[PDB]
């Protein structure tokens, strides 16, 4: 009864549930938990959907059979949920197949919507320059619009909705590569529930530049047929037709937990998880951060040093706008430094770091992490006011605080990674001791004085280049 005591206590959450489900070899416990999933809030369980579905595929039938009933239940009350399941089910098996087909067995409008987006991207491969690609895209997006507002939605959206219109002229391609990703803007009419609501009616139709997000909404809105409606909102997604997003999703989950951990404790680190959508092992979409551009290009259009740009765009050292931006810089630096360290993120350069209009940095390309095989340049240190600076000392103070916080909730983090490693061929799990090395990096045995030194050492390392 001592076990059952815990499961019936307040201490029992979806996190704990999955852990026992993952670890317990007792079929009685597995089945017990399978049933208890229903009592939890839909939102809480959703976050762990990749784990649940992974277990289903790669674990003993007993474990699977306990999870399935809950999944089917959700699938039956939400096609969004249905969609995300089917996509995940497929991507993570290359046991799964039986259930995927049953779920897909309705979604045809959406799957064709998604198919076309993927199809588009693959065609642009024959156009060897960036802007050549852009023009074919813009043209071809216009063909999408010919399809009326459809019984399709962007799973990457925070809410339920119908897609009505694609402002094709605003879309842009992000690089010149063979299977280049591309950014698009999408118009939607919000729902209260997708599953019960009539597709909106067509409203007959009749320039793109560098601008803030709210200025872009104005311009797109004003031009749009549906723009007058209060129901109307603008979304955005990056489409990756030939890039795997399964590592990207994993990192996202890790970032989200760490975000919650640092939120739960009172450490004012700052980071920004961006939503991920796995479509295949081949392909996915990303919800982009608005009002942000790469550091590298920030330096190419400005011709300035990082510090100088801050001063230009926000103000002199005596201004509020600057000090706010500096603070946001320092806090976002400490956050992402810690994330880079814990996940062992590599391939770190100014192409992979974004700067938002408030001064936060944001890392983005999470290939090369963990077993798969961060820089504190003086340009970054300058913005912080220099090594002797109080704000720089504070940067070090935040890192320690955020490290101490992470240790207090280490298990929530390792859980996320350790389950995913299951039966996994991701390059990040290439090692024999991927999860084991991860735990060592938390230094759970260390005293805080020891951690101060380690933090000092970390910073010293980050400067060598």
């Amino acid at each position: 009864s001592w076990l059952l005591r815990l499961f019936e206590s307040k201490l029992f959450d979806i996190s704990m549930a999955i852990s026992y489900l993952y670890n317990s070899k007792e079929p009685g416990v597995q089945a017990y938990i399978g049933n208890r999933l229903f009592c939890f809030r839909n939102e809480d369980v959703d976050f762990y959907l990749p784990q649940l579905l992974n277990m289903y595929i790669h674990m003993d039938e007993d474990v699977g059979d306990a999870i399935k009933p809950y999944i089917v239940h959700r699938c039956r009350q939400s096609i969004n949920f249905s969609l995300q399941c089917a996509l995940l089910l497929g991507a993570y098996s290359s046991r799964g197949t039986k259930l995927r087909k049953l779920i897909l067995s309705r979604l045809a409008p959406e799957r064709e919507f998604i198919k076309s987006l993927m199809a588009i991207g693959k065609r642009l491969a024959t156009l060897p320059t960036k802007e050549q690609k852009t023009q074919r895209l813009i043209s071809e997006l216009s063909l999408l619009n010919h399809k009326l507002p459809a019984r399709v939605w962007l799973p990457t959206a925070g809410f339920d909705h119908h897609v009505v219109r694609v402002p094709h002229t605003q879309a842009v391609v992000l690089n010149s590569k063979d299977k280049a990703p591309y950014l698009i803007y999408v118009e939607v009419l919000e729902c209260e529930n997708f599953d019960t609501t009539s597709v909106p009616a067509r409203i007959p139709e009749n320039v793109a530049l560098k601008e803030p997000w709210q200025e872009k909404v104005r311009r797109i809105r004003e031009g749009s047929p549906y723009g007058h409606l209060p129901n109307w909102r603008l979304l955005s997604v990056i489409v990756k037709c030939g890039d795997d997003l399964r590592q990207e999703l994993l990192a996202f989950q890790v970032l989200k937990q760490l975000q919650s951990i640092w939120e739960q404790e009172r450490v004012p680190l700052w980071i920004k998880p961006y939503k991920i959508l796995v479509i295949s092992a081949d392909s996915g979409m990303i919800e982009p951060v608005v009002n942000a551009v790469s550091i590298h290009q920030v330096k190419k259009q400005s011709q300035l040093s990082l510090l100088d740009y801050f001063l230009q765009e926000h103000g002199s050292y005596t201004t509020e706008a600057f000090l706010s931006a500096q603070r946001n810089f320092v806090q976002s630096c400490a956050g992402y430094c810690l994330v880079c360290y814990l996940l062992q993120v590599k391939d770190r350069h100014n192409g992979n770091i974004l700067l938002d209009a408030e001064g936060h940095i944001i890392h983005i390309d999470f290939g090369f992490i963990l077993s798969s095989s961060f820089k504190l340049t003086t340009e970054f240190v300058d913005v912080m006011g220099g090594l002797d600076g109080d704000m720089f000392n504070y940067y070090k103070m935040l890192m320690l605080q955020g490290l101490i916080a992470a240790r207090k909730h280490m298990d929530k983090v390792v859980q996320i990674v350790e389950i995913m490693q299951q039966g996994s061929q991701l390059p990040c799990f290439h090692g024999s001791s991927t999860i084991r090395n991860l735990k060592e990096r938390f230094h759970m045995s260390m005293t805080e004085e020891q951690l101060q030194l380690l933090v000092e050492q970390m910073v010293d390392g980050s400067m060598r280049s």
């Binding site: 005596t318 000090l323 000392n393 103070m397 605080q401």
Partner: protein
């Protein structure tokens, strides 16, 4: 922002340093508490005698080594809990402290916090103010909980500071 005044908060653990900072700068308080690990930073701008200043407040800890942030501080709020005599008792050692690691010409305010705990008072206002003028410190009692004198405390020390006008 005309000026920039750096101020530190120091004192025994539990006296309310961290809540003083959150009340004064974000107008927030909490009964549940997390011990301050190292240092915490918050900022707010005010006007004294017609002049716009900006204060950078540092919430230190009761992790003994927070010393470094002291340097280049014009003012320091040294806080004790009125309802816990020991915290007032160590104020003598806390003044010997400032006379080791900080500017010998720094503005100090003695602060009795948690004045709302009327019935638990373990340090009489007279005894405190006596020590206050026995020394070279300014003195006030605050409650972070009800926000009594919290604004006053900052505005006092900042005004006192500005009285260092150079000719």
């Amino acid at each position: 922002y005309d000026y920039l005044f750096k101020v530190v908060l120091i004192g025994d653990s539990g006296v309310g340093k961290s809540n003083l900072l959150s009340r004064f700068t974000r107008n927030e308080f909490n009964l549940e508490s997390k011990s301050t690990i190292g240092v915490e930073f918050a900022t707010r701008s005010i006007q004294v005698d017609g002049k716009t200043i900006k204060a950078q407040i540092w919430d230190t800890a009761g992790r003994a080594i927070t010393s470094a942030y002291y340097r280049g501080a014009v003012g320091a709020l040294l806080v004790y809990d009125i309802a816990k005599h020991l915290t007032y008792e160590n104020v003598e050692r806390w003044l010997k402290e400032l006379r080791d690691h900080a500017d010998s010409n720094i503005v100090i305010m003695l602060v009795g916090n948690k004045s709302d705990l009327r019935h638990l008072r373990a340090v009489p206002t007279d005894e405190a103010r006596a020590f206050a003028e026995k020394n070279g410190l300014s003195f006030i009692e605050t409650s972070a909980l009800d926000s009594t004198n919290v604004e006053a405390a900052f505005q006092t020390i900042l005004t006192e500071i500005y009285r260092i006008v150079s000719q």
